[PDB]
Design a protein around this ligand. Structure first.
Ligand SMILES: Nc1ncnc2c1ncn2[C@@H]1O[C@H](COP(=O)(O)OP(=O)(O)O)[C@@H](O)[C@H]1O
Ligand SMILES: Nc1ncnc2c1ncn2[C@@H]1O[C@H](COP(=O)(O)OP(=O)(O)O)[C@@H](O)[C@H]1O
Ligand SMILES: Nc1ncnc2c1ncn2[C@@H]1O[C@H](COP(=O)(O)OP(=O)(O)O)[C@@H](O)[C@H]1O
Ligand SMILES: [Mg+2]
Ligand SMILES: [Mg+2]
Ligand SMILES: [Mg+2]
Ligand SMILES: [Zn+2]
Lengths: 232, 609, 410
DNA sequence: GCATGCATGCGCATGCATGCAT
DNA sequence: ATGCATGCATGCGCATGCATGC
């Protein structure tokens, strides 16, 4: 158990791998007689650690301007995309322009138009499709990789529940929700479930997901570029 | 000394009648309306006195007490007669706080004893409870009355004589507690939400309900550790509200509305339908139907308690990429109470209110559904074909009479569901087959179609001229950039200003209506209650008879929906809506002719070989 | 402030000088109350309007005090109108006679209850709008009853007998919970300092019927997008056994809290219930479809009748069912799966008073000796259809599941 | 036509915290 | 002054109802 004070609060999100330096101490709340069913333990005080340090596991502008000002930026970027994979120059260029992406535009009427690109790939097994998806996931600043049916311990789309104890609306971040402005790679496009398949239509079209349950109606934002692979 | 100076400054703030002030008129209105709460803009106070505003923001309780005292003195000076009823008045706050605009996630101890503004959703509410202010007791043995004030309950006299309580002579005030949770649309993904507790007193008790988005301005304070020889050193923080607002009218635009109506008259409906959505090209009949939904019909109740529906329902079917979802989103944006519910997004338990047994008290309570919340509103259903049959059966009752009947042993109720429905669905074959009859393509039961009022079929005909016009419009809209924004940057008049890209050189002869003026006019028209005339009734009846007898005059064309008794009500409702479109009092012939033309267009379609 | 003696005298003279109704009603009522031929008396505030109207406002503001004053005045007036002894006297009357033959609390010797009826000029309120401003006042509420508790006795005055003396000790009860006495406060025991211990007596003690009920708002008065609210009403005296679940009632009562937050409740004073083939004249045609409904409403001499109407959509079958539901005194209307399963038959639920389990019936149970209406019959579940068939053929429902083993009459 | 997956009420016991009647 | 009954989660075991998939 860890105790953080003052400015150390909210520096760590649950799930992070951390190295913490602190003081090993015990709780002090006076004295009290042992209670409960078990009274074998005598003179035992609960212990904790008081946290004191946490570690979580302008010049570049000119460099980027020089890189983009060349006449051969397109070829350099295309070659930079997966040099290990033989061939597929057009596919690499398409992947690069997908990574850069377009621009979204609003209108006075309030309607919005999509600014992200979606791609589909079909082919026989052994054409190195998963490798491209992994390279895109690693290269993109924000990237998610799924198997179509969700993942080991996370679904493809968000879900909403209500905690009976606290009566609060808890939302589980799905694969699409966890990415905002990034790239979502989807292998095995054929094996999608019905509800996820229905939701992905709205996710691709309006980049939003609408969920309505007892006493709640919400519209979450999912501005995700989609890169998909499927088999014959 | 400081409190007296603050009171003097607050008193000086209110006396603005000789300085173009409005607060005196506000106080007069409050006295007229029997209200004892005044809302003061923080921005105006900061403009007039920055030091007082800073002191109030950094120190709330003392400054608020001083301001309440100043308001008491001011109301006394105006009419001491009114001030006798209430002991003290209460203060409301409004404006832009800036750094103190704090979300539930960002609340910290740095804002203690300050005034903060929060925006959130309500999740927990408590029953209204009375709280004692003063107590009066009487002694039958000695015929003596005693008074106590609260800010120990006596039971016996000095000579141990019993005391009897006078409940009527006592003073009680309302009290309630609510919970506010951070909106999921703004909370980081994958993280648990955080909540705040708010206390409501006096007239603010019944201004919030669970599942609603509110904005609350109030003071932030700690609760002292309760009695005990040992303390843990941790205090609970609870917000004390002073103003609650439901997040969502002018004065001189009435003249503009009257002039526009008295001028255009007949052209009002055509202009409103034309300017519904510039971003979408074509589909005039669909826009007219959407405008009719926005206006709506007239609900009628009679002596026997019978109810006649006044809402309209429209179902759109067509090929992909014909701008149906765009229309649904536009209706969602424009309509005041609009709720989107996709096919498999919500089930029958979500669309319809349910019963849950409360573990705290052992009772059974009702939780409202999606359609229950949208009373006198619009519900949009995309991917309507994917919806299960049971959900359609549940929706049937709302579409028929707009009411929901619920009963689980120990409780039974009927809730109002007077709403309107937009539905978007795809053909069974993916794309609309021209040769096959509409019955095979739609693939829906006759009852569901009959309960719908209008059916529209949209086709993506690849005509070169239509394609050229659509491409022109789409690229003109895409090339547009908002004025005042630098090129390459990343991310009220009745008639809208002409734009070279949004409208075009040819469209200079005509103009589109502004959104705000359109909303105001729609609201005013919805207020109006038209009356049907005798001339139109016979015409409508004869045309209904002609429509029913058209079975022998249909030629090679087929009918999209069966013609039943509900079609006559649909005709009358569309006529009433079109009469509402232009501010009038009676139904005319052209009013029924428009609805007849709409029915002619909607109900019959040619079949290609 | 004002002296209560003058107002008590005014009440006494009002109870004796209201001939303007021609027979003296209050004289007869007092005679019946004195001869134990009547156990309840109701006072009309509209009748008081002939006298000074200030009394009406005072009662509307401090109802309990004036109720006690009226009770005391009636008790004092009772001896004057007595003419004869009790013809047939019960156990309590025997105790009263023996005690008089040989201070006693006023309510112990008292054997009548008084109630107030709200003025007709007083407009009925809404359950949502009763708040702290109405605490301690007299209000009128219209609603629908949803839950009713069983009748049980409740103590009023407790009687204790000493271990070493014949003296009887009396203790009034004005709280939901009370502390029993131990030592004997009798003068004999006080002088001798014997320290005898008291014992409770059930025969000498006084009990009154007690009942709980709940009310809900009408669907018409519910605001936009809200849910009907519920209120709790306490029933005592002869008002017991009047209200039943599913009935539309109007109750006149007092708004009182319970112990600086508090919980509120209502104390009831008056509870009230709210060719010929012209069924639904709004619907054209169907001349031969309306006599069948009339015969269904009339019924046979088992003589029950069941009717089913199958039709194409748009011929307005639902409106006829709604009209039948509205016309019948005891009626229930079902739309579909919104009242399936537990909605019909019955379920077991906790009690508010006893703290144990009791059976609450569904729509079919409420519609006993009435008419039930079902819409979209083909869409019902198999279990519901079997239950409906059982009701039609046998008129009783048999339930045998974990914790439930019952046969309900329908 | 039925067994099973997924909520949800029911009844219960068990553990942790605290607040004061004898 | 001190030890205990109670309010508030939480696991346990169970039955019951709604949806669907072969
Ligand atoms: N054109 C290629 N250049 C280099 N390696 C390749 C190429 N095609 C296939 N491979 C190799 O073969 C393997 C293909 O497996 P994988 O990419 O998972 O197939 P798929 O994605 O189609 O299921 C990869 O590990 C990759 O190293
Ligand atoms: N008539 C039209 N005018 C302008 N844009 C159109 C038109 N028809 C289609 N579009 C464009 O094509 C896209 C269609 O997507 P969407 O509205 O989701 O189609 P649907 O609702 O039929 O599934 C929209 O983004 C819209 O900008
Ligand atoms: N014979 C008739 N006379 C008058 N109105 C009718 C008649 N038949 C149908 N209607 C109208 O048509 C509508 C039918 O709706 P509804 O009662 O829900 O039909 P159903 O009960 O068959 O589902 C009603 O609102 C009613 O006003
Ligand atoms: Mg692969
Ligand atoms: Mg669409
Ligand atoms: Mg019907
Ligand atoms: Zn004794």
């Amino acid at each position: 158990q860890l105790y953080c004070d003052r400015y150390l609060c909210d520096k760590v999100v649950p799930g992070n791998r951390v190295t913490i330096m602190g003081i090993y101490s015990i709780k002090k709340f006076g004295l009290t007689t042992s209670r409960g069913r078990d009274r074998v333990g005598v003179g035992i005080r609960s212990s904790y650690i008081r946290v004191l340090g946490i570690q979580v596991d302008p010049q570049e502008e000119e460099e980027f301007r020089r890189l983009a000002a060349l006449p051969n930026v397109y070829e350099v970027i295309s070659k930079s995309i997966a040099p290990s994979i033989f061939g597929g120059t057009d596919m690499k260029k398409a992947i690069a322009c997908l990574l850069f992406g377009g621009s979204r535009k609003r209108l006075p009427d309030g309607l919005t138009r999509r600014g992200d690109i979606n791609l589909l790939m079909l082919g026989d097994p052994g054409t190195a499709k998963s490798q491209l998806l992994k390279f895109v996931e690693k290269c993109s600043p924000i990237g998610v990789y799924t198997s179509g049916k969700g993942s080991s311990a996370a679904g493809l789309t968000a879900s909403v529940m209500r905690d009976p104890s606290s009566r609060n609306f808890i939302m589980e971040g799905g694969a699409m929700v966890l990415a905002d402005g990034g790239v979502v790679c989807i292998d095995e496009f054929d094996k999608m479930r019905e509800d996820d398949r229905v939701a992905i239509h709205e996710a691709m079209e309006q980049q939003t997901i609408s969920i309505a349950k007892a006493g709640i109606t919400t519209t979450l934002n999912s501005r995700c570029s989609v890169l998909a692979a499927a088999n014959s | 000394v400081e409190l007296r100076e603050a009171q003097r400054d607050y008193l000086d703030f209110l006396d603005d009648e000789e300085d173009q002030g409005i607060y005196q008129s506000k106080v007069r209105e409050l006295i007229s309306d029997n209200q004892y709460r005044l809302i003061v803009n923080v921005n105006d106070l900061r403009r007039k006195n920055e030091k007082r505003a800073n002191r109030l923001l950094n120190n709330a309780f003392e400054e608020l007490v001083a301001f309440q005292r100043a308001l008491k003195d001011f109301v006394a000076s105006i009419d001491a007669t009114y001030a006798k009823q209430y002991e003290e008045f209460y203060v409301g706050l409004e404006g832009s706080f800036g750094s103190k605009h704090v979300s539930p996630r960002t609340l910290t101890s740095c804002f203690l004893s300050c005034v903060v503004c929060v925006e959130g959703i309500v999740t927990k509410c408590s029953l209204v409870r009375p709280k004692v202010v003063r107590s009066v007791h009487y002694c039958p043995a000695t015929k003596k009355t005693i008074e106590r004030r609260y800010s120990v309950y006596p039971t016996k006299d000095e000579e141990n004589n019993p005391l009897e309580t006078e409940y009527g002579l006592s003073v009680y005030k309302d009290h309630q507690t609510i919970t506010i949770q951070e909106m999921p649309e703004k909370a980081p993904a994958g993280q648990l939400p955080r909540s705040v507790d708010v206390i409501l007193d006096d007239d603010l008790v019944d201004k919030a309900k669970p599942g609603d988005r509110v904005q609350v301005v109030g003071t932030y304070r700690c609760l002292p550790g309760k009695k005990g020889g040992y303390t843990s050193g941790t205090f609970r923080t609870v917000l004390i509200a002073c103003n609650v607002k439901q997040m969502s009218f002018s004065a001189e635009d009435i003249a503009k509305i009257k002039k526009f109506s008295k001028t255009r008259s007949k052209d009002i409906f055509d202009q409103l339908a034309k300017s519904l959505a510039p971003s979408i090209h074509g589909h005039d009949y669909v826009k007219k139907a959407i405008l009719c939904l926005l206006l709506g019909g007239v609900e009628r109740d009679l002596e026997n308690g019978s109810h006649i529906r006044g809402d309209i329902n429209i179902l759109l079917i067509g090929d992909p990429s014909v701008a149906k979802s765009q229309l649904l989103r536009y209706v969602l944006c424009t309509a005041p109470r609009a709720i989107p519910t996709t096919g498999r997004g919500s089930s029958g338990v979500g669309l319809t209110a349910a019963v849950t047994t409360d573990q705290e008290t052992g009772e059974r309570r009702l939780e409202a559904g999606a359609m229950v919340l949208a009373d006198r509103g619009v519900v949009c259903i995309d991917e309507f074909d994917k919806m299960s049959d049971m959900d359609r059966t549940a929706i049937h009752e709302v579409m028929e009479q707009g009411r929901v009947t619920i009963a689980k042993a120990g409780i039974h109720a009927r809730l109002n569901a007077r709403c309107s429905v937009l539905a978007a669905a795809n053909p069974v074959y993916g794309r609309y087959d021209q040769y096959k009859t509409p019955m095979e393509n739609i693939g829906l039961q006759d009852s569901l179609l009959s309960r719908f009022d209008l059916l529209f079929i949209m086709l993506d005909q690849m005509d070169p001229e239509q394609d050229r016009e659509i491409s022109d419009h789409v690229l003109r809209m895409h090339r547009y950039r908002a004025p005042g924004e630098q090129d390459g940057d990343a991310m009220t008049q009745i008639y809208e200003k002409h734009d070279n890209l949004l409208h075009g050189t040819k469209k200079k002869k005509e103009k589109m209506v502004s959104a705000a003026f359109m909303k105001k006019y729609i609201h005013v028209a919805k207020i109006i209650k038209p009356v049907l005339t005798q001339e139109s009734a016979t015409y409508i009846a004869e045309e209904y008879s002609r429509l029913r007898s058209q079975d022998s005059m249909s030629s090679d064309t087929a009918r999209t929906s069966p013609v039943t008794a509900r079609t006559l009500e649909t005709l009358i409702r569309l006529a009433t809506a079109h009469a509402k479109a232009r501010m009038s009092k009676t139904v005319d012939l052209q009013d029924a002719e428009e609805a007849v033309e709409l029915v002619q267009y909607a109900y019959f379609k040619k079949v290609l070989e | 402030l004002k002296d209560y003696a003058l107002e008590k005298e005014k009440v006494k003279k009002f109870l004796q000088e209201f001939y303007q109704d021609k027979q003296f009603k209050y004289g007869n009522q007092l005679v019946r109350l004195a001869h134990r031929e009547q156990v309840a008396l109701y006072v009309d505030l509209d009748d008081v309007a002939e006298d000074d109207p200030e009394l009406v406002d005072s009662i509307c503001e401090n109802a309990r005090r004036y109720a006690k004053l009226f009770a005391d005045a009636v008790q004092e007036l009772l001896p004057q109108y007595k003419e004869r002894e009790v013809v047939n006297k019960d156990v309590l009357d025997v105790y009263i006679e023996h005690r008089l033959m040989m201070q006693y609390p006023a309510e112990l010797m008292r054997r009548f209850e008084l109630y107030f009826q709200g003025p007709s000029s007083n407009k009925p309120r809404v359950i949502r709008e009763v708040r702290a401003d109405s605490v301690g006042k007299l209000v009128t509420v219209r609603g629908i009853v949803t839950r009713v508790s069983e009748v049980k006795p409740k103590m009023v005055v407790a009687t204790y007998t000493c271990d070493q003396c014949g003296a009887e000790t009396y203790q009034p009860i004005q709280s939901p919970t009370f502390m029993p006495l131990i030592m004997c406060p009798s003068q004999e025991c006080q002088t001798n300092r014997s320290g005898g211990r008291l014992y409770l007596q059930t025969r000498g003690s006084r009990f009154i019927k007690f009942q709980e009920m709940k009310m809900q708002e009408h669907s018409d008065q519910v605001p936009v997008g809200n849910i009907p609210r519920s209120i709790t009403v306490l029933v005592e005296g002869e008002n017991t056994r009047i209200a039943q679940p599913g009935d539309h009632v109007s109750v006149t009562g007092i708004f009182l809290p319970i112990l600086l937050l508090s919980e509120t409740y209502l104390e009831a004073h008056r509870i009230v219930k709210m060719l010929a083939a012209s069924i639904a004249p709004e619907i054209y045609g169907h001349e031969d479809v309306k006599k069948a409904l009339l015969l269904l409403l009339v019924g046979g001499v088992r003589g029950n009748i069941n009717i089913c109407l199958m039709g194409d959509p748009g011929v307005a079958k639902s409106q006829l069912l709604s009209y039948i539901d509205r016309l019948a005194p005891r009626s229930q209307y079902t739309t579909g799966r919104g009242s399936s399963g537990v909605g019909l038959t019955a379920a077991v639920l906790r009690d508010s008073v006893s703290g144990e389990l009791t059976l609450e019936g569904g729509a079919l149970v409420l519609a006993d000796q009435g008419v039930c209406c079902i819409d979209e019959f083909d869409k019902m579940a198999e279990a519901d259809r079997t239950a409906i068939h059982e009701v039609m053929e046998q008129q009783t429902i048999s339930i045998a599941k974990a914790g439930i083993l019952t046969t309900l009459n329908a």
